[PDB]
Design an enzyme around this catalytic site. Structure first.
Site, PDB file in Angstrom:
ATOM      1  N   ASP A  80       7.520  34.564 -50.230  1.00 56.93           N
ATOM      2  CA  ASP A  80       8.856  34.937 -49.767  1.00 56.93           C
ATOM      3  C   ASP A  80       8.946  35.068 -48.225  1.00 56.93           C
ATOM      4  O   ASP A  80       9.079  36.171 -47.686  1.00 56.93           O
ATOM      5  CB  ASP A  80       9.296  36.230 -50.471  1.00 56.93           C
ATOM      6  CG  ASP A  80      10.767  36.558 -50.262  1.00 56.93           C
ATOM      7  OD1 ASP A  80      11.532  35.732 -49.686  1.00 56.93           O
ATOM      8  OD2 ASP A  80      11.237  37.652 -50.662  1.00 56.93           O
TER       9      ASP A  80
ATOM     10  N   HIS B   6      14.295  34.950 -49.330  1.00 62.07           N
ATOM     11  CA  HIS B   6      15.416  35.383 -50.172  1.00 62.07           C
ATOM     12  C   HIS B   6      16.646  35.865 -49.377  1.00 62.07           C
ATOM     13  O   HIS B   6      17.710  36.086 -49.949  1.00 62.07           O
ATOM     14  CB  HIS B   6      14.971  36.399 -51.229  1.00 62.07           C
ATOM     15  CG  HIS B   6      14.885  37.813 -50.733  1.00 62.07           C
ATOM     16  ND1 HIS B   6      13.681  38.437 -50.464  1.00 62.07           N
ATOM     17  CD2 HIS B   6      15.853  38.735 -50.499  1.00 62.07           C
ATOM     18  CE1 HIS B   6      13.910  39.678 -50.077  1.00 62.07           C
ATOM     19  NE2 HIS B   6      15.222  39.889 -50.098  1.00 62.07           N
TER      20      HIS B   6
ATOM     21  N   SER C 190      14.245  43.763 -46.300  1.00 63.37           N
ATOM     22  CA  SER C 190      13.576  42.466 -46.460  1.00 63.37           C
ATOM     23  C   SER C 190      13.411  41.739 -45.138  1.00 63.37           C
ATOM     24  O   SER C 190      14.354  41.703 -44.328  1.00 63.37           O
ATOM     25  CB  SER C 190      14.345  41.584 -47.415  1.00 63.37           C
ATOM     26  OG  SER C 190      14.449  42.259 -48.653  1.00 63.37           O
TER      27      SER C 190
HETATM   28  C1  LIG Z   1      16.138  41.108 -49.892  1.00 66.26           C
HETATM   29  C2  LIG Z   1      15.531  42.465 -49.487  1.00 66.26           C
HETATM   30  O1  LIG Z   1      16.422  43.210 -48.655  1.00 66.26           O
HETATM   31  C3  LIG Z   1      15.075  43.332 -50.680  1.00 66.26           C
HETATM   32  C4  LIG Z   1      14.213  44.527 -50.273  1.00 66.26           C
HETATM   33  C5  LIG Z   1      13.961  45.435 -51.482  1.00 66.26           C
HETATM   34  C6  LIG Z   1      12.671  46.252 -51.351  1.00 66.26           C
HETATM   35  N1  LIG Z   1      12.581  47.271 -52.392  1.00 66.26           N
HETATM   36  C7  LIG Z   1      11.645  48.251 -52.410  1.00 66.26           C
HETATM   37  N2  LIG Z   1      11.606  49.064 -53.392  1.00 66.26           N
HETATM   38  N3  LIG Z   1      10.755  48.395 -51.406  1.00 66.26           N
HETATM   39  N4  LIG Z   1      14.406  42.513 -51.694  1.00 66.26           N
HETATM   40  C8  LIG Z   1      15.020  42.180 -52.829  1.00 66.26           C
HETATM   41  O2  LIG Z   1      16.137  42.639 -53.160  1.00 66.26           O
HETATM   42  C9  LIG Z   1      14.268  41.190 -53.742  1.00 66.26           C
HETATM   43  C10 LIG Z   1      14.808  39.756 -53.582  1.00 66.26           C
HETATM   44  C11 LIG Z   1      15.708  39.553 -54.747  1.00 66.26           C
HETATM   45  C12 LIG Z   1      15.095  40.337 -55.875  1.00 66.26           C
HETATM   46  N5  LIG Z   1      14.418  41.452 -55.178  1.00 66.26           N
HETATM   47  C13 LIG Z   1      13.964  42.580 -55.726  1.00 66.26           C
HETATM   48  O3  LIG Z   1      13.542  43.514 -55.063  1.00 66.26           O
HETATM   49  C14 LIG Z   1      13.947  42.673 -57.237  1.00 66.26           C
HETATM   50  N6  LIG Z   1      14.144  44.099 -57.663  1.00 66.26           N
HETATM   51  C15 LIG Z   1      12.593  42.122 -57.717  1.00 66.26           C
HETATM   52  C16 LIG Z   1      12.354  42.257 -59.194  1.00 66.26           C
HETATM   53  C17 LIG Z   1      11.230  42.942 -59.663  1.00 66.26           C
HETATM   54  C18 LIG Z   1      11.000  43.069 -61.029  1.00 66.26           C
HETATM   55  C19 LIG Z   1      11.899  42.492 -61.945  1.00 66.26           C
HETATM   56  C20 LIG Z   1      13.026  41.806 -61.488  1.00 66.26           C
HETATM   57  C21 LIG Z   1      13.244  41.691 -60.120  1.00 66.26           C
END
Ligand SMILES: *C[C@@](*)(O)[C@H](CCCNC(N)=[NH2+])NC(=O)[C@@H]1CCCN1C(=O)[C@H](N)Cc1ccccc1
Ligand SMILES: *C[C@@](*)(O)[C@H](CCCNC(N)=[NH2+])NC(=O)[C@@H]1CCCN1C(=O)[C@H](N)Cc1ccccc1
Lengths: 232, 232
Positions: B86, B41, B184
């Site tokens: 991912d 992602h 991520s």
């Molecule tokens: C891309 C990364 O930097 C990031 C890391 C976030 C980790 N969060 C926690 N709490 N440890 N990941 C993201 O932003 C990913 C990829 C795009 C969507 N995403 C999400 O975290 C969404 N919040 C996933 C989601 C869960 C439930 C319903 C809708 C979306």
């Protein structure tokens, strides 16, 4: 098929019988004149046959068309460990002749989940008991889709394996109605619409309430791969 | 990183900072002299940079090695809808120079699940609060793996999405400790072993007990793809 009944001969003309070998069968759906969609776990050899317009396996029928596989296209994301994406497209050496007895089952336009409580049907030549072998004639049973969260329950699959968003569960709360060995690949029909592909259940427990049959959902992702693989 | 602390400069020499663009960062692990494993992602452009041997993002450091991507290898079974698989391998234009500050994180030999209750660490330059932007220095937090069945709970992810066998959940029962936006790709380390890849949580709720961070498991299937893509 467990707890189903013998279909009116040729009343499900999209049904494909896969004669894999001497010990094994599978089913499938004719989705184009030269394309059969079945399950990836169904292993063909060079002697394997795809039979269209069948009712009885053994009896000779003027309606039958014996087809041959030009190329196998197993879904590249099939995971045998999770059972995820248990799909395979078989390209035929020739085009089927469409008639009253041999027809194309249409793909759904939208890859929706199927809502719990919906009534669905699955047909097949597989086990009619948790013993013995295939049924000589095509049978069909009606089943209800079971809520995914119930399916992942302690009283069900209990994360062995996980039943995810690209699978549905279908059976009955009381049991007695299910696909079984040899029904893999068979289309799950729900309110007139092609919705899933027969994948798995519990070993020697077809129709046990603990293990409602699991069908691969024709979701957006799977439809895309099907469409792509065919057209081009 | 939520509820972590600034790492001793260069005490985690396998950590990769991904400068994707002006608004976005990611992390990753150096797994070979010219291979970085991160999340699919995380979208790079032509200006994106892979920075090795970093502590501070801004400050100029003699330890830093600014690398460029020759080719992206996103995992072909990555599903953006389920968040499944991912993973992404970045091939570098040149080999990193290994030293005290830039090292290779070894892949696990066996793709085991991580047992609930295990203590794990994740490092990153992401949000330290559910607001603002990245941290200028690399931080690290310790987290516990949360049982997969609890993670799929009504008080957790509740099948939106499903947390399957190729993901683990890790955080704390009380909250306060998590990866967050910009983390991520970062390696999840458990008892000395590379175990997962930071993927997702709940939007603007990093560290909320309802949404323990979800990490892609380095399972058999994912290891095979990693090994294959590198060697050959
Ligand atoms: C891309 C990364 O930097 C990031 C890391 C976030 C980790 N969060 C926690 N709490 N440890 N990941 C993201 O932003 C990913 C990829 C795009 C969507 N995403 C999400 O975290 C969404 N919040 C996933 C989601 C869960 C439930 C319903 C809708 C979306
Ligand atoms: C290949 C198909 O004919 C067949 C259909 C079985 C459907 N069963 C029910 N109850 N509706 N599928 C299989 O045999 C698949 C592929 C190989 C494994 N398999 C199973 O059904 C196993 N029983 C799946 C399994 C579940 C839990 C734990 C271990 C294995």
């Amino acid at each position: 098929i467990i707890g189903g009944n013998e279909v009116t001969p040729h009343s499900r003309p999209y049904m494909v019988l896969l004669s894999l070998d001497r010990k094994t069968i599978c089913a499938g759906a004719l989705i184009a004149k030269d394309w059969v969609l079945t399950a990836a776990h169904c292993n063909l050899n060079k002697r394997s046959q795809v039979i269209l317009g069948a009712h009885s396996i053994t009896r000779e029928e003027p309606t039958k068309q014996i087809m041959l596989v030009k190329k196998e296209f197993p879904y590249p994301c099939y995971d045998p460990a999770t059972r995820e994406g248990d799909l395979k497209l078989l390209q035929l050496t020739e085009k089927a002749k469409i008639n009253k007895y041999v027809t194309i089952l249409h793909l759904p336009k939208k890859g929706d989940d199927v809502k719990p409580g919906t009534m669905c049907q699955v047909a097949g030549w597989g086990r009619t008991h948790n013993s013995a072998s295939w049924s000589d004639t095509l049978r069909e049973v009606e089943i209800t889709i079971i809520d995914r969260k119930v399916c992942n329950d302690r009283n069900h699959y209990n994360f062995n394996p996980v039943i995810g968003m690209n699978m549905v569960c279908a059976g009955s709360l009381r049991g007695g109605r299910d696909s079984c060995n040899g029904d893999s690949g068979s289309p799950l029909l729900c309110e007139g619409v092609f919705r899933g592909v027969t994948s798995f259940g519990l070993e020697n427990k077809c129709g046990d309430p603990r293990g409602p049959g699991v069908y691969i959902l024709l979701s957006k992702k799977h439809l895309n791969w099907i469409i792509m693989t065919i057209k081009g």
